[PDB]
Amino acid sequence: AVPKKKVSKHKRGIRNGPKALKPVPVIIRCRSCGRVKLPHFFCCSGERG
Amino acid sequence: KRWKFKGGPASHGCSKAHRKGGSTGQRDDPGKVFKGRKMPGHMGAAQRTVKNVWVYKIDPARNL
Amino acid sequence: LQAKDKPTYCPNRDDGDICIVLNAKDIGITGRKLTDKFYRWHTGYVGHLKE
Amino acid sequence: PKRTFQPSTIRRKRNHGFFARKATKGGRRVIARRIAKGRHRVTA
Amino acid sequence: MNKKEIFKLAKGFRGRAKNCIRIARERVEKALQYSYRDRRNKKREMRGLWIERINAGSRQHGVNYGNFIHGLMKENIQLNRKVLSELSMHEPYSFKALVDVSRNSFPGNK
Amino acid sequence: ALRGVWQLQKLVVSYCNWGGSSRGIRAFMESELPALIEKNPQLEVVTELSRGQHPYLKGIYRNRNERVVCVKNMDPDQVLLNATRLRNSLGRKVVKLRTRHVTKHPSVQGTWTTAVKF
Amino acid sequence: KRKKVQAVLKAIKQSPKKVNLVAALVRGMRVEDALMQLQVTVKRASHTVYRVIHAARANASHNHGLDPDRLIIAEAFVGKGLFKKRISIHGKGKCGLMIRPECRLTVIVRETTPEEEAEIARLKVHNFKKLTKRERRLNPHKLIETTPIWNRRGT
RNA sequence: UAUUCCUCAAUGACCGAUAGCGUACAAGUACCGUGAGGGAAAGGUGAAAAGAACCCUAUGACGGGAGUGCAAUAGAGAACCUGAGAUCCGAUGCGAACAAUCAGUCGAAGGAGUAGUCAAGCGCACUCACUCUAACGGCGUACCUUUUGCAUGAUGGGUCAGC
């Protein structure tokens, strides 16, 4: 099966519309190492390890 | 599984159509698939009722 | 409803008056239309013409 | 599968080489046409 | 017609029909055919609108359009339908006077 | 003229004394231009030599609109007709006339509404 | 004095569509918010967009006397580069054309206006209102600063 | 008298980079074929290289400054004069998730941006002002070819530029 017609820029934009990226709602930055990370990601242990 | 369709033969030349539905309509008249055509999809996890279910025993201490 | 009784009538505008129809159960129907006139419609499922 | 070209250097020189062309009148015409066109490879 | 004139006439067209000469030429020629036809059709539509406005104006006083316009003809009143509809919309008392005059001229049957 | 005030203020006659395409405007300058200058005392007529270029007439109006009409290879009567059409114009933009009756007071007796009583 | 500062990165060896998928996310964001958002977006193009935004902020601060802490991303768009064409061999002796694409990325920054700072402050107060896309880009995430604590006496 | 593998001089209402020789550029090359044989593509920074020291951010300057230059999108490494179109990503204004169809045409509510003219008092009403958009209404089954006759579910064309 082949496409019967060329797809217009309008229909292509409609198709690719919901596939746009969205911003992450919550971002954690460690005050010690400065790493920017999602919740439930390990970067540092505290001092007197 | 969903509609108890018979499927195709396991041998005698059958080519990659062992569990498929076969024909889904007629040709050009009607030129379309009718509503309610039995096709694959989600099965179960739906509300159903069983009628005339017989109560055998009541346990009032445990509410069983 | 079409505001075609107004001298300011415009076909692209909805400017009709509000029509309140009272006593709809007492409308006059002649002939044998009570038993012979049918409303028919199709639900979109084959074989399901309702009347 | 087995393909049409099976290389052999001595068969190439015996069929299309310089002295193979020089041995026949048609081969000498091939060489003359070949030089007249200006090909860098006169014989194979 | 030149390619630049066609692109001028295709301004505001949707899709590739404003942009590509093979597609634009057909749509522009069809637009020009519509324009030629609609110069004729506008006169029919506007006379229909004037007659609707006159009929609405005269039926408020109990006179149908045909009796009204024939009563005006019978009295040698030669106002045309465009001006009569403008009177029915904007000068209703003068239009009512004309309706009374035409009803005395030609009441019609009933 | 808009309410009695003439709108065309300047008529520029741009021409070449060498080029063959300015023959008609040169004959217009010699023959018809003094009569038009006489009949229009409110109009300023300046004449400009532009060698090597095709001739034109330019009309500058009260509303600061300028209209140029090329008159290359024209007969003198066509040049005079173009100058007359420049004089008779109000200097407006050439767009489609939306109506043929401009009024700010469409009704003397009041527009028909549903509240009108007879 | 200058209002708009840009940075351009040419000859990025990626698809323009894939780069624009990430570049469209950071449009209308403050520069620090966008830089934080790119570090949690798992894409190849995230590092490239990060580099161009970083270069643009540096250009604005160093060459044009703009304040780097008040920059918003006005534009981020992609242009094509020099595409490289190869033959793509199929079965049965047929072939198509394969392209190794290239792209350029342009990021334009500008300083936030005081009205826009007032709106940003108004967006950070607590309410249940729906945000438009532009207002969401102004306040894209909640930033949480955490300190590592050893022997926080729990589990 | 015939012819041009050749030489010297000259001419052209001959061509000017898809043209003119197949070749304006290291072409009978690259490439294809066992072989005979077939056979390309690809010209142009600037007057002069003065071809961008140094700084900043990237792993890395082709970026942003600085400087050279008349001009730097005139900033290139077989390619930078001009720099169209299809095509791709953005910015602003208006429309847009209760309404269907060669996508226009004739009317047109509203929205948005923007000028100027001047008698009389320095406003204000005039230029149907102008530009963009278009809710809503009426009308409207592409083009070419071939045919007795094509919206035709007959043919041809993905689009653009050059020929």
Ligand SMILES: [K+]
């Ligand atoms: K060639």
Ligand SMILES: [K+]
């Ligand atoms: K230049």
Ligand SMILES: [K+]
């Ligand atoms: K260019």
Ligand SMILES: [K+]
């Ligand atoms: K319409």
Ligand SMILES: [K+]
């Ligand atoms: K056929």
Ligand SMILES: [Mg+2]
């Ligand atoms: Mg069975």
Ligand SMILES: [Mg+2]
């Ligand atoms: Mg079975």
Ligand SMILES: [Mg+2]
């Ligand atoms: Mg098989």
Ligand SMILES: [Mg+2]
């Ligand atoms: Mg099988």
Ligand SMILES: [Mg+2]
């Ligand atoms: Mg059908």
Ligand SMILES: [Mg+2]
């Ligand atoms: Mg060989």
Ligand SMILES: [Mg+2]
């Ligand atoms: Mg394969």
Ligand SMILES: [Mg+2]
């Ligand atoms: Mg392809």
Ligand SMILES: [Mg+2]
């Ligand atoms: Mg492809």
Ligand SMILES: [Mg+2]
């Ligand atoms: Mg070329």
Ligand SMILES: [Mg+2]
């Ligand atoms: Mg050229």
